[PDB]
């Protein structure tokens, strides 16, 4: 709030424009980063009805329809753990939290239902048990090892998910 | 307008040079911009002070210019290293990294020269129209579970076949396409069929 | 909007792709008469997958597709004389 | 104290001896009126880019 | 006095802008790494150890 100060500053040159262009570049890169990291899928895949995924319990990572927020329980824990004076303005991001949650849910549904075929062409449905058998066939072991131990595998997966949830809810 | 990433560097360089040239015609607090007119109609001490003012201003401007040039050269070197890696693992071999050297299954690439850059031509392999079928984990013939060696057990409604996972080539289910391991008591979803023995 | 006051555009209860980004999810575009509209951007088209216990989809054809990727490599080599710059 | 801002009737209670409060950034936020024992708020008016 | 204040505040603002540029470069590198990890691991099966 000074006119003589501004008249004096006008003698220095074009530094304000330079720093403003730098800040604008930073601000646009901050949105390009998230728009490149999260927006990697074309179609928003939806979760199917009540699901018999072989025995695996994907109840802690799918979007919770109870609250209006499309965030799951782990996302709620992660959001709850992390907690206009002199010309400073905080510009809002381009993508809200709900769009990020929808992108993550679409990616999760694509990885669960289709597998690894929704990143090259069209989504191809396949039972989750056969998908895990193909993963085991890729890591070296055969398919019988999974076809005879799917129960133990699902139990260990559920136990690991529970332990991860407990660790996230205990310490951050 | 597709080659914008190559034009942005030239635009930024031109803008920086123009900003420097325009800053060469400032005062930063003085009697005049040009230095000889300062010492022409003025006493030695005040002229030297006004020259020192311009010296400090131009030093600050040049330091800011050098800092911006270093910051830009860092990103340019990062992009050049990425381009060198993408030139190595695109053409001198077939990569298995998803969405790295092209969208889809990678086959080959061809490099092309460009002003202050490089243009790649990724030849990929994209699937096509699908067709629904019915699959089963294994097949029980004589109390033994038959698992597919390399492929899926595909049925067209009446009979069963075996084909690869990337192309529909139904083959006759025989003992040369499956291996016996275990019995039909553990596999959840075991189906009944007849394995042909040549 | 949530990023300020948009004077000059009209709202619409539709969802298209983001042509001109504004902020907080709001996007603008120039569509038909002709005027400036403001709508909430759509992430994509809903495509549910028909999952079941016994169903697989195997393709029958293929389509070759060549793409293009451009990456900067180097810049212009410059050198400024400090003495001649500062002192004329 | 002096300054320019939008005066609004706030509700933060003050001590019987205190006169004006500040914030973490050491800026004038709330000032008690000298005549009436009421707590007011000082907020700068809108500013931004076009 | 106004010239001295302007010089001091301009130096402070330039230092702030430089720090923000460095932090933005670091964040862009981290975001590129995260995008690579998302594209090569989630949408497939990587054979890269650790
Ligand atoms: C999955 O875990 C949740 C955790 O509370 C539980 O309520 C649900 O019944 C479980 N579902 C299955 C199929 O085990
Ligand atoms: C799945 O395949 C069956 C034939 O086996 C067909 O009748 C059905 O329409 C297919 N479903 C989808 C969603 O393609
Ligand atoms: C399935 O393929 C066999 C080929 O041996 C054919 O004889 C049969 O009619 C086909 N079934 C249907 C429902 O198309
Ligand atoms: C679910 O999948 C199992 C495994 O193949 C199968 O045995 C069962 O019949 C399926 N149930 C339904 C309702 O599709
Ligand atoms: C396969 O054959 C066995 C013995 O003949 C029988 O117990 C079983 O139920 C059959 N499975 C089907 C799916 O028909
Ligand atoms: C694949 O599509 C091309 C393009 O129409 C067609 O010429 C060709 O016959 C198709 N292949 C098969 C096996 O149908
Ligand atoms: C001061 O004078 C005003 C008259 O406008 C009156 O309303 C107020 O109550 C007075 N305050 C005291 C403390 O006497």
The 3-class secondary structure across chain A, one letter per residue, is: CCHHHHHHHCCCCCCHHHHHHHHHHHHHHHHHHHHHHCCCCCCECCCCCCCCCCCCCCCCCCCCCCCCCCCCHHHHHHHHHCCCCCCCCCCCCCCCHHHHHHHHHHHHHHHHHHCCCCCCCCCCCCCHHHHHHHHHHHHCCCCHHHHCCHHHHHHHHHHHHHHHHHHHHHCC
Cα–Cα distance, B170 to B160 (Å, whole number): 9
C-alpha–C-alpha distance, residues A10 and A5, integer Å? 9
**Closest residue, chain A, to D4 (C-alpha):** A1
Query: What is the separation, in whole angstroms, between the first and last Cα of chain D?
Result: 32
| B100 near E CB under 8 A | yes
Report d(CA A112, CA A126) in Å as an integer: 9
Q: What residues contact residue C27 under an 8 Å CB cut-off, 6+ apart?
A: C16, C17, C18, C19, C20, C21, C38, C39, C40, C41
Buried b (16+ CB within 10 A) or exposed e, C2-16: eebeeeebeeeeeee
Nearest ligand to the C-alpha of residue B136?
A: 4
Beta bridge partners of B117: B114, C72
C-alpha B132 – ligand 2 centre gap (Å):
5
> What is the spatial distance between Cα B84 and Cα B82, in angstroms, rounded to a whole number?
5
What technique solved it?
cryo-EM
Q: Is the CB of D35 under 6 A from ligand 7?
A: yes
Q: Which residues line ligand 2 (CB under 6 A)?
A: B 132-134, 157; C 50, 55
Residue D25: its chain A contacts at CB < 8 A?
A: 85
Structure tokens at E41: 């691991």
Q: Can you tell me the distance from the alpha carbon of B172 to that of B142, in angstroms, rounded to the nearest whole number?
A: 18
Q: Is the dihedral of CA B28, A22, A82, C22 positive or negative?
A: positive
- DSSP secondary structure code for residue B125 in this structure: E
Query: Residue A102's CB: how many other CB atoms inside 10 A?
Result: 18
Q: Which chains reach chain E with 3 or more Cβ–Cβ distances below 8 angstroms?
A: A, B
Q: Which of E39, E35, C65, A112 is CA-nearest to residue B105? A: C65
Beginning with the edge strand found earlier in the chain, give each strand of the sheet holding C26-31 in spatial order: C10-11, C35-40, C26-31, C20-23
Strands of C2-85 (E only): list them. Answer: 10-11, 20-23, 26-31, 35-40, 56-57, 62-66, 69-72
Q: What is the DSSP letter of B152?
A: E
Q: At what angle do helices A73-81 and A97-109 cross, to 10 degrees?
A: 140
| Residue B107 token pair | 């086959």
CA distance A102 to A70: 7
Q: Do A85 and D27 touch (CB under 8 A)?
A: yes
Does the beta-carbon distance from A37 to E34 stay under 8 Å?
Answer: yes
Chain-centre distance for alpha carbon A155: 25
The answer to whether the CB of B192 is under 6 A from ligand 5 is yes
Measured distance CA(B184)–CA(B6) in Å, rounded: 63
How many Å apart are CA A66 and CA A58, to the nearest integer? Answer: 16
φ, ψ of residue B51 to 5 degrees: the values are: -70, -40
Strands of the sheet with D6-9, listed across from one edge: D6-9, D39-43, D28-32, D20-22
Which protein residue's CA is at the shortest distance from atom 7 of ligand 2? B132
Beginning with the edge strand found earlier in the chain, give each strand of the sheet holding B191-192 in spatial order: B178-180, B145-148, B139-140, B191-192
Instruction: Flag if E10 and A40 touch (Cβ within 8 Å).
Output: no
Site of tokens 């403003």: A20
Integer-rounded Cα Rg, in Å, for chain D is 12
**Cα distance from C35 to chain B (closest Cα, Å)?**
25
- Compute CA distances C23 → A104, C1, C26, whole Å: 21, 9, 5
Handedness of CA B101, B103, B107, B113 (dihedral sign): negative
Strand order across the B160-163 sheet = B160-163, B152-155, B132-135, C56-57
DSSP 8-class letter at D45: P
Q: Residue E32 class from Cβ within 10 Å (0-12 exposed, 13-18 middle, 19+ buried)?
A: middle
A14 has a chain D CB within 8 A of its CB: no
What distances in angstroms separate CA C53 from CA B12, B135, B159, B193, one per listed residue? 57, 9, 19, 19
- Among A8, C71, B98, which residue's Cα sits nearest to residue E43? B98
Whether E and C touch (3+ CB pairs < 8 Å), yes or no: no
Q: Which tokens sit at A83?
A: 């907690």
Q: How far apart are CA B134 and CA D21, in angstroms?
A: 74
Which of A13, A143, A150 is opposite residue B23, by nearest beta carbon? Answer: A13
Please give the backbone phi and psi of residue C41, each rounded to the nearest 5 degrees, phi first.
Answer: -65, 145
């Amino acid at each position: 709030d000074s006119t003589e100060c501004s008249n004096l500053l006008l003698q220095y040159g074009s530094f304000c424009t330079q720093l403003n262009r730098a800040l604008t570049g930073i601000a646009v890169e901050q949105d390009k980063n998230t728009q490149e990291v999260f927006a990697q899928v074309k179609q928003i895949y939806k979760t199917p009805p009540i699901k018999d995924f072989g025995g695996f319990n994907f109840s802690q990572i799918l979007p919770d329809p109870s609250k209006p927020s499309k965030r799951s329980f782990i996302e709620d824990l992660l959001f709850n753990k992390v907690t206009k004076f002199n010309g400073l303005t905080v510009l809002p991001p381009l993508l809200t939290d709900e769009m990020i949650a929808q992108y993550t849910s679409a990616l999760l549904a694509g990885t669960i239902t289709s597998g690894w075929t929704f990143g090259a062409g069209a989504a191809l449905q396949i039972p989750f048990a056969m998908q895990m058998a193909y993963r085991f066939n890729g890591i070296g072991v055969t398919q019988n090892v999974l076809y005879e131990n799917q129960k133990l595998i699902a139990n260990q997966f559920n136990s690991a998910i529970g332990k991860i949830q407990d660790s996230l809810s205990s310490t951050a | 307008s597709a080659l914008g990433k190559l034009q942005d560097v030239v635009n930024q360089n031109a803008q920086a040079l123009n900003t420097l040239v325009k800053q060469l015609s400032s005062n930063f607090g003085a009697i005049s911009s040009v230095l000889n007119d300062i010492l022409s109609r003025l006493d030695p001490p005040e002229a030297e002070v006004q020259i020192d003012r311009l010296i400090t201003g131009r030093l600050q401007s040049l330091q800011t210019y050098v800092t911006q040039q270093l910051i830009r050269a860092a990103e340019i070197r990062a992009s050049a290293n990425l381009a060198a890696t993408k030139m190595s693992e695109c053409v001198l071999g077939q990569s298995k990294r998803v969405d790295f050297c092209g969208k889809g299954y990678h086959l080959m690439s061809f490099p092309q020269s460009a002003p202050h850059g490089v243009v790649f031509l990724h030849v990929t392999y994209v699937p096509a129209q699908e067709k629904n079928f019915t699959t089963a984990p294994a097949i029980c013939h004589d109390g033994k579970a038959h698992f597919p060696r390399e492929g899926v057990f595909v049925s067209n409604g009446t009979h069963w076949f075996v084909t690869q996972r990337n192309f529909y080539e139904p083959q006759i289910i025989t003992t040369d396409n499956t291996f016996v391991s275990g019995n039909c008591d553990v596999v959840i979803g075991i189906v009944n069929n007849t394995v042909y023995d040549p | 909007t949530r990023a300020g006051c948009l004077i000059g555009a009209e709202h619409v209860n539709n969802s298209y792709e983001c042509d001109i980004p504004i902020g907080a999810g709001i996007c603008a575009s120039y569509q038909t008469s002709q005027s400036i509209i403001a709508y909430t951007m759509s992430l994509g088209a809903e495509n549910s997958v028909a999952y079941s216990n016994n169903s697989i989809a195997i393709p029958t054809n293929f389509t070759i597709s060549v793409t293009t990727e451009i990456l900067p490599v180097s810049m212009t080599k410059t050198s400024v004389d400090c003495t001649m710059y500062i002192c004329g | 104290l002096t300054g320019t801002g939008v005066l609004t009737e706030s509700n933060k209670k003050f001590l019987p001896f205190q006169q004006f409060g500040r914030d973490i950034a050491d800026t004038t936020d709330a000032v008690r009126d000298p005549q009436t024992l009421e707590i007011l708020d000082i907020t700068p008016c809108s500013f931004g880019g076009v």
